[PDB]
Amino acid sequence: TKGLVLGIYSKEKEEDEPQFTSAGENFNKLVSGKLREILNISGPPLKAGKTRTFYGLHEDFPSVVVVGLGKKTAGIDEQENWHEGKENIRAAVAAGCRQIQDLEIPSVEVDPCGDAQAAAEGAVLGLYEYDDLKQKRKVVVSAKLHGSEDQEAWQRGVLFASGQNLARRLMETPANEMTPTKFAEIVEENLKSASIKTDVFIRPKSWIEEQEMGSFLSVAKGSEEPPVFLEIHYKGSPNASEPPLVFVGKGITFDSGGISIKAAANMDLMRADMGGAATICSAIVSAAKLDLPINIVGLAPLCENMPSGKANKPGDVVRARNGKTIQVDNTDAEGRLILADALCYAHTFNPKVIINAATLTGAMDIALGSGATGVFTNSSWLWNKLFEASIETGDRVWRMPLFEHYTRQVIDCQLADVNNIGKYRSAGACTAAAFLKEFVTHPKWAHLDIAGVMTNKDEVPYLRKGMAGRPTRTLIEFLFRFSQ
Amino acid sequence: TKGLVLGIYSKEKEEDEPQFTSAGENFNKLVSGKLREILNISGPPLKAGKTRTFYGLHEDFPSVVVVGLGKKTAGIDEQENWHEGKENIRAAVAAGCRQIQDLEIPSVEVDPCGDAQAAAEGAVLGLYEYDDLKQKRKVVVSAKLHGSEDQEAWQRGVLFASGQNLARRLMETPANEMTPTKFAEIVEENLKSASIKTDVFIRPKSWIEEQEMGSFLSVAKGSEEPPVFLEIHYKGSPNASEPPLVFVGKGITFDSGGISIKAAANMDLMRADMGGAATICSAIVSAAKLDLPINIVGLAPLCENMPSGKANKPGDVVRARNGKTIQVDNTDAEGRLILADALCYAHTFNPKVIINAATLTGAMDIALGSGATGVFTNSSWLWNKLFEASIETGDRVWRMPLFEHYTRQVIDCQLADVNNIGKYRSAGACTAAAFLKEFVTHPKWAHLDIAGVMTNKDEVPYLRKGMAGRPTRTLIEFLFRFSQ
Ligand SMILES: CC(C)C[C@H](N)C(=O)O
Ligand SMILES: CC(C)C[C@H](N)C(=O)O
Ligand SMILES: [Zn+2]
Ligand SMILES: [Zn+2]
Numbered sequence A, B: 001t002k003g004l005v006l007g008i009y010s011k012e013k014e015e016d017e018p019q020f021t022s023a024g025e026n027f028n029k030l031v032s033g034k035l036r037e038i039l040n041i042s043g044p045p046l047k048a049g050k051t052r053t054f055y056g057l058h059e060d061f062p063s064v065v066v067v068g069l070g071k072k073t074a075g076i077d078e079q080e081n082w083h084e085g086k087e088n089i090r091a092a093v094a095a096g097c098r099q100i101q102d103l104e105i106p107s108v109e110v111d112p113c114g115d116a117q118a119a120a121e122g123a124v125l126g127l128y129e130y131d132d133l134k135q136k137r138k139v140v141v142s143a144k145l146h147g148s149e150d151q152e153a154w155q156r157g158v159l160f161a162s163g164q165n166l167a168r169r170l171m172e173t174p175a176n177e178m179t180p181t182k183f184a185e186i187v188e189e190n191l192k193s194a195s196i197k198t199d200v201f202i203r204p205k206s207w208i209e210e211q212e213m214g215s216f217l218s219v220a221k222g223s224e225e226p227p228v229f230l231e232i233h234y235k236g237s238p239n240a241s242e243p244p245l246v247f248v249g250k251g252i253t254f255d256s257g258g259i260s261i262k263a264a265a266n267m268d269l270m271r272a273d274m275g276g277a278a279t280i281c282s283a284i285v286s287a288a289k290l291d292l293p294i295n296i297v298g299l300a301p302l303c304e305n306m307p308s309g310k311a312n313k314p315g316d317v318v319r320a321r322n323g324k325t326i327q328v329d330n331t332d333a334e335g336r337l338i339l340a341d342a343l344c345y346a347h348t349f350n351p352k353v354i355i356n357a358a359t360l361t362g363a364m365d366i367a368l369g370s371g372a373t374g375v376f377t378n379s380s381w382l383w384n385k386l387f388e389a390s391i392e393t394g395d396r397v398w399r400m401p402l403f404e405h406y407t408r409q410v411i412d413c414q415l416a417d418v419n420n421i422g423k424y425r426s427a428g429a430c431t432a433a434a435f436l437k438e439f440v441t442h443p444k445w446a447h448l449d450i451a452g453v454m455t456n457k458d459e460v461p462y463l464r465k466g467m468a469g470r471p472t473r474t475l476i477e478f479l480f481r482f483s484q
């Protein structure tokens, strides 16, 4: 019928037994001490992230899963740059919820564990799974807050997690289904359901050609799938003339590499080469659901990178919207090409800040893996705001260098103004970022390379195996704090 | 006979002509305005790093090379994390000196350019070249300060640069000449010439075996070249009982990869796989020449990594000095093996701080290239001291993450306590650093991965093509500031 997830902390030295949360101690009382008695009989105490299931304790809750929360007073961890307490909660709740799902129970009530937003994030992120195309599926579990106190915190958590889950769905979906047009239509419907203060323009190829986006066009032409330039507006500020914050996302729905073709091994993961677009767009949908009082513009060039009789050829020279020429030495370095045009266009909105996200380089994954998103920025103020936000969400960011040293390696070019791959193979993520800087004149610009946090195997406990949707929540948190 | 290098700044808006330095304006006066007149006739003004040669202006200086210094008031660059003025000076002076050398002039007098230490660094770093083994060599140039004002600043610069040049020589020298024993003997003689307050112990294999350094021994055994553990003491503090700062360096004189053999292409560069040892040792020699009032200990395990009938075999399990077991899954991840033992030993000196340097991973080069040295540390205080020092020297450092997320990938091990390569190929430099942390219990430890700054092609203007010796000067500066 209905399941229940309860938390218990690790025992502190001067305590006689590990302490339950408020909901845990109360439940124990409701069942006349039966919960504590059975936990004692079952064996060793529960450590952070571990779970244990007890049956028949109450007629309304035939299955009760107790989860280990770790140390009660865990706050900000200086070594890890995150709030440890929140991370323990998200992981423990996800584990509890999955045990309830394995038991095939359709609904679960969750202990707020001293921080309802984090508990909600663990349940919602933890239970997610993309199974639309399978006949064999797990039971759909409805998770709700146990109790009626602090409902707003719980709901804030569901909102944040739902935002990241949308990014995951968009990324996980096979490319033949998640085409440039389909992605745009899904985002449009999600933003419009979130708020009536929105405008969406799924700009077609003719518009792209009118905007002189020759760099973006050179990439798209190799494929038979039509390209689109997604532009979204969220008018949340009281003053309509208030300059917007602009977000830009790389939307390659599928990257085969083009003529500079990729190796077969694990190339299926390239259906998520639109993760940049998925994360910034989901962040705008959430900000819109939250009705944040700020104006926001989202831009996402979308297309496929395929080999054919009309594809980009190594050595070809293309002209960006701003007139700069680019020598396309490697057709698989296509993200920086489409972003050159999107970033130029971003300046037309005379924005307050410009933030782009992209699953850009294999070098970023080699650099930091899934530990943190790499952030390249010309503004320490901006770096600090993103960093602070990440400490709260736990979806970490780490700063990478924007030095002229790297710019030199991309402007040293045989045929044009700038080369799309550096002279050397060293510092791939840094030279890619340097390339993007040639298309930015704004004082507050940040580039997020999310190639390393594209997927999850088991690094983040509360995310099942698959596309991660990172760092959506950090983006939402940043916008939230910015609006205040 | 004698050459002269003079600097000129870029013209500021309200100036009528670009301004010479004090020495430049004075020289012009000595030759009755002849220098300004010829510079005007020659054409365009000189920009940062550019040079122009003028002949017969003075009987004592038949060749005068004027160098562009860029903007006079260039101070700390917030984008680049360095003092721009100093960088302009080092590069301009190096260029001037090389033009004098191409002219085959044996001696040059150098303009202090408003910062004699930086001018000296440019001349000394700029003229260096390892040519001991060649019949064809360039003329040996003696560079001296032009004038007698601020001689201490000039000499400080020669000292710092000479320290980095020694590291370059040690790294550049072919491995058949730069063996573990030879390296130790060269370092010993350099430290002893620098100060009488020193003790050096070139510990032999029997000592290594007594110290139970099974991890370090497993690497060395594959080669016929005897291993040595270099231990150096600099007793500069007034109080002999004052706890020392300990430096540790990876000293692989040649890395073939062992049974997990490297590819042939550019493997010759592996003669510099002892760069970690070269930099920390040269830094201690310089600190000793400077008679810094601090106690310092330097530790450097040295050996070759070769394939043979007795070499490390993939899957073998070895025991570190501290008793932890290590599964050697890849024999080419040998630096972390030798460092495990050296870091354990470092704790026996009950140090104030522990700093190790190593040309450790190819992943670090992929991460940041030669832009900056990667620093992994459990102390933000320590990170800040190294960072501040680097701003002054221009030999930059950039912080990398020490997260438990990476530790998990090395302790997940089939046969032993820790695995010498991670479960995944992502974040190579971070997992290597995590591996090292398992052998450190100190509160102030910093790991410097210098694999990306091992060589110079043309990135650093004042260093000719070859082994760079980075980041020696940043290490010296750190020690200098620490002693004050
Ligand atoms: C590893 C990937 C993120 C590579 C990236 N798709 C590049 O455009 O090919
Ligand atoms: C690129 C190199 C620094 C690799 C390093 N010598 C490892 O032990 O093989
Ligand atoms: Zn997809
Ligand atoms: Zn690509």
Ligand SMILES: [Zn+2]
Residues within 6 Å of the ligand: A252, A255, A273, A332, A334, A335, A359, A360
């Ligand atoms: Zn791509």
Ligand SMILES: [Zn+2]
Residues within 6 Å of the ligand: B170, B171, B172, B173, B174, B175, B178, B253, B271, B272, B274
């Ligand atoms: Zn050498």
Ligand SMILES: [Zn+2]
Residues within 6 Å of the ligand: B255, B257, B305, B331, B332, B333, B334, B335
């Ligand atoms: Zn190796």
Ligand SMILES: [Zn+2]
Residues within 6 Å of the ligand: B252, B255, B273, B332, B334, B335, B359, B360
């Ligand atoms: Zn090595």
